[PDB]
Ligand binder design. Sequence first.
Ligand SMILES: [O-][O-]
Ligand SMILES: [O-][O-]
Ligand SMILES: [O-][O-]
Ligand SMILES: [O-][O-]
Ligand SMILES: [O-][O-]
Ligand SMILES: [O-][O-]
Ligand SMILES: [O-][O-]
Ligand SMILES: [O-][O-]
Ligand SMILES: [Cl-]
Ligand SMILES: [Cl-]
Ligand SMILES: [Cl-]
Ligand SMILES: [Cl-]
Ligand SMILES: [Fe+3]
Ligand SMILES: [Fe+3]
Ligand SMILES: [Fe+3]
Ligand SMILES: [Fe+3]
Ligand SMILES: [Fe+3]
Ligand SMILES: [Fe+3]
Ligand SMILES: [Fe+3]
Ligand SMILES: [Fe+3]
Ligand SMILES: [Fe+3]
Ligand SMILES: [Fe+3]
Ligand SMILES: [Fe+3]
Ligand SMILES: [Fe+3]
Ligand SMILES: [Fe+3]
Ligand SMILES: [Fe+3]
Ligand SMILES: [Fe+3]
Ligand SMILES: [Fe+3]
Lengths: 171, 171, 171, 171
Amino acid sequence: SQIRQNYSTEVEAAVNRLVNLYLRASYTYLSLGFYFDRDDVALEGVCHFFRELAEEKREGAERLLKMQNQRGGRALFQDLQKPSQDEWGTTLDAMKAAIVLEKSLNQALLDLHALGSAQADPHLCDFLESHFLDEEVKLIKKMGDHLTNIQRLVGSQAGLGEYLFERLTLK
Amino acid sequence: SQIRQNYSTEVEAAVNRLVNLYLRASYTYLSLGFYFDRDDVALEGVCHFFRELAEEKREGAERLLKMQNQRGGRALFQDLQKPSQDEWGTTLDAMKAAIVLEKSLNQALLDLHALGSAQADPHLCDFLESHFLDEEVKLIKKMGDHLTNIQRLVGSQAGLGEYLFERLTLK
Amino acid sequence: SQIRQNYSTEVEAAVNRLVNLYLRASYTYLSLGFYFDRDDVALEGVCHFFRELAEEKREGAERLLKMQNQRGGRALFQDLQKPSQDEWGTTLDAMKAAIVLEKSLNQALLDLHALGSAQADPHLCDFLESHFLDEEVKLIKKMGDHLTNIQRLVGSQAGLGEYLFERLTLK
Amino acid sequence: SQIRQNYSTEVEAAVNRLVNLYLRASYTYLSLGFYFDRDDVALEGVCHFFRELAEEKREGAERLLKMQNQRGGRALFQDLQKPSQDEWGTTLDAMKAAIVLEKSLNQALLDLHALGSAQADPHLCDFLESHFLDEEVKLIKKMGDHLTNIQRLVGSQAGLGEYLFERLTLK
Ligand SMILES: [O-][O-]
Ligand SMILES: [O-][O-]
Ligand SMILES: [O-][O-]
Ligand SMILES: [O-][O-]
Ligand SMILES: [O-][O-]
Ligand SMILES: [O-][O-]
Ligand SMILES: [O-][O-]
Ligand SMILES: [O-][O-]
Ligand SMILES: [Cl-]
Ligand SMILES: [Cl-]
Ligand SMILES: [Cl-]
Ligand SMILES: [Cl-]
Ligand SMILES: [Fe+3]
Ligand SMILES: [Fe+3]
Ligand SMILES: [Fe+3]
Ligand SMILES: [Fe+3]
Ligand SMILES: [Fe+3]
Ligand SMILES: [Fe+3]
Ligand SMILES: [Fe+3]
Ligand SMILES: [Fe+3]
Ligand SMILES: [Fe+3]
Ligand SMILES: [Fe+3]
Ligand SMILES: [Fe+3]
Ligand SMILES: [Fe+3]
Ligand SMILES: [Fe+3]
Ligand SMILES: [Fe+3]
Ligand SMILES: [Fe+3]
Ligand SMILES: [Fe+3]
């Protein structure tokens, strides 16, 4: 590549893996969204929340792919593994699973920053810092908040709690 | 002081103490606010309510400091003692503590008015009347109202009550 | 904490100390501001300059407290030590003291970045970089500029120099 | 008087004396204003400052006269004694004399409040508090500030200091 400069094959490879993680997160959230749109679940605000996350994660992957090209790396695509579940249980189950997922994405971002740092690739480190690390931290805080409110509510009368959360907190 | 007129050293000293009480109230409310912003508490409307009070109390102190200068007194600052608690429990615990705090501020205002009256300092008395006494009374009424509503709600299912209060009453 | 990830107890503790430094800086600037508002000092542009800094430092502390919560740390508040002086002398004395203060805040920021770097906490490093390091550098440059102009002016006729600076440079 | 209620002849009499003090202050300020408008003094910003005060004091007297009528007292007018000087010296001399004058007006207001208090006349006390006491305190603070700045400036080169004050502080 005529443009490639200070961009290691290790970072290129990790970037392609991170794109796959993001597309997979996006796929997971798509399945979460349409689960809550079922007539027997019917929590529209939960559906909108996860469908918005499907979009965000897809955008994350595209920004990674745009960056890969800017550096002269080569995008390599792999199979996208289907989500870990077909049914997601209650809002509480679903938000717990979403937090697990975001934490693993965040861990992958931190591992990539550490690689970039080891490879002395400051553009990589800045790119993650600017576009991904802060947004992951903000998102995980939001989910933890949600989880605290769902839990507070589904003490007595789980059904009432679940309806109230979706109506009064979710968009 | 070329400007000082009818302004006793007793009133000057009490004014400096009242500034310290207000800054301390402000500090207490800052700690209340960020406690309710924790991911394991997550009552954003309670956080906004106390963060607004932190600001109000800070402004109260500045108005007192501006007045002290207008009269030719000398501002003297002391250590600000940290809030009485690190964790504030439920919304109910927190609102009870806030009411205790406001009542003690109000008592300090009343003691200063009584001093001003004893010293025949009408400008002091009017300044407190105009800017502090009415606002304290209105605020304490608001808190008592809140406390009544929290209590009414946290009879059965304390968690549901706490969520509903924060969603339907707080901003 | 359900959300805490890659956030060491060392960084949490240093963050709480930095909040205390900022609140203390804010307190110092409040005292600087009202000193220059005295009828026997009466340099309104110097008062506005330090009162603006009191506000900025308070905001710095709140951003740190918001961040602490975003990461799952626990805010811990301590006593705020009163400012180092009760009277601040001339504009020159005061600006020198302000520069000392800002330099020590900047040093605390640099020590926290070095800790974050040692702990491999990129979100911390980026957060300081983005919101604090640049603003401290810009502010310290501004103060040094001011100090040079005050000094140039208070060569002959210190009183005239001090009035002219406040009228023609300060807002 | 069909309307007179709780309005003692002592307060009525003191009110008429206070009107005379205000009209006399107004007259003093008129003479201060036109002195600084002389071609051999020529400090237009000082002239505007005192001419504005002549107007304020005249308004103070009219508010007192309107109040006297509202209570069923009878306005009684006396001779207005000419100002204490024909020439007012420097800006510094003039501002010192203005501060003396305002302090004596303020003292007369405080004596009238004390009378009103002794006579249990709350409407009188409130009327002074609302319209006169605060404005006197604010004005005296402003004058003291001015005096500090004039003094700071007329250390070396009294003429330069006097010109700069009038240009950069006065309207
Ligand atoms: O669209 O971000
Ligand atoms: O929505 O970004
Ligand atoms: O702002 O009151
Ligand atoms: O808000 O005052
Ligand atoms: O407000 O920064
Ligand atoms: O002002 O930031
Ligand atoms: O016109 O006051
Ligand atoms: O001008 O009142
Ligand atoms: Cl290379
Ligand atoms: Cl006195
Ligand atoms: Cl971890
Ligand atoms: Cl009667
Ligand atoms: Fe969308
Ligand atoms: Fe979006
Ligand atoms: Fe987006
Ligand atoms: Fe979008
Ligand atoms: Fe606000
Ligand atoms: Fe406010
Ligand atoms: Fe306010
Ligand atoms: Fe405000
Ligand atoms: Fe401001
Ligand atoms: Fe600001
Ligand atoms: Fe700001
Ligand atoms: Fe601001
Ligand atoms: Fe006018
Ligand atoms: Fe006017
Ligand atoms: Fe007026
Ligand atoms: Fe007018």
